[PDB]
Amino acid sequence: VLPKKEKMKLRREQWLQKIEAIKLAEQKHR
Amino acid sequence: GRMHAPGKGLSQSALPYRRSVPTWLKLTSDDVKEQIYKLAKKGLTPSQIGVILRDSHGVAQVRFVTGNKILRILKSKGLAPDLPEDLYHLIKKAVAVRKHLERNRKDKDAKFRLILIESRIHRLARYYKTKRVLPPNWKYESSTASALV
Amino acid sequence: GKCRGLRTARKLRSHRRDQKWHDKQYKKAHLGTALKANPFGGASHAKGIVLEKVGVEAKQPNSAIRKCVRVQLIKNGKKITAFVPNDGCLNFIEENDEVLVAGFGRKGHAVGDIPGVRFKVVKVANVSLLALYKGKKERPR
């Protein structure tokens, strides 16, 4: 289908995106 | 799973949460202990004593009523054997299988199962040597095996 | 599954020692018998005496006839064959000359064009081939 390199990049990028989203959500609580 | 078999079965006894003696049991602790004494004088293993007391007299758990287990009760009076009952039954089974093997030399299945039995014997003997029930010079030997029974 | 106890250090490092031995580069670098079989003797260059000039045929899909020199190394007596950059640079080399010979370039591997030639000639008569080609220097005989 598509090489595993950009699948790994997409997964780690979306994971850091959830990290940033939950960081902003938890910062909003203060 | 089983120590030498490939079986993995769940079946066992399940004790209830109520450790209290039921109200309908009118036997006192010393009456139960006297039954234990006369049953042991009849020549019974603590397992057999527990089964008989559960079935006929209605004593569900001897430790819940008397406060001590059967082997400790027999030990305080002194009516307890030198080697424990599970090791006795294992050594008796090993003697029986070895007799069958000396009569029947082609039974390689019997050889394999005898090896299983005496390995179980070695594990239990190691445990009993570690917790001082057996003397440290005790060792299970093939000819001395029938002498223990 | 790998063991993960707090007292499994000896087992882990013994296993790693052995499985290190199962690698070609580690075994070549640690067995000693590669430098005991390398014609250069572990060196990057070596000098030699030009035994003769031979011709090696190139690969099948692109036919060519390249010209090499068979030289004998000074320090250990081994005979190797060495590549020359073009047919003009072959005229600067004579039988019974002193030559300084290096590897062909990819840390020890053969040529992807010319089959089984391993070495290239860098200097002849203690002067370089590059200077001789460009007219920067002359060579003695």
Partner: protein, 129 residues
Amino acid sequence: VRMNVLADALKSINNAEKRGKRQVLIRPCSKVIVRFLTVMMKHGYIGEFEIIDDHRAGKIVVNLTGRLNKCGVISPRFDVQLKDLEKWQNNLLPSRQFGFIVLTTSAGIMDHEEARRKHTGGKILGFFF
């Protein structure tokens, strides 16, 4: 056989959380398990739990809430000197803000921030983010 019941508890909770369950049963109970669950409770990750007491090792029914991404054990229980602690979180946490190394120290079972405040080290048990 069954060794390290804390690993079994944390794996059960993680597998329950990934299926979007609300409530999970844990057997057997332990002191270390209850302290770990209290640590996750105080940071608002696993809500509420109640210990069912039979006359054996007990059981725990835990009310999952939804914030928890991954709870995990670290086996073996590596010693964590206070310097090495920093390295540990960069190995286990996806950020330097959230996620929790849980240490058992002589001051108790706690997280890495409170262990840094109390200025002590100990054995690493897990992490949750």
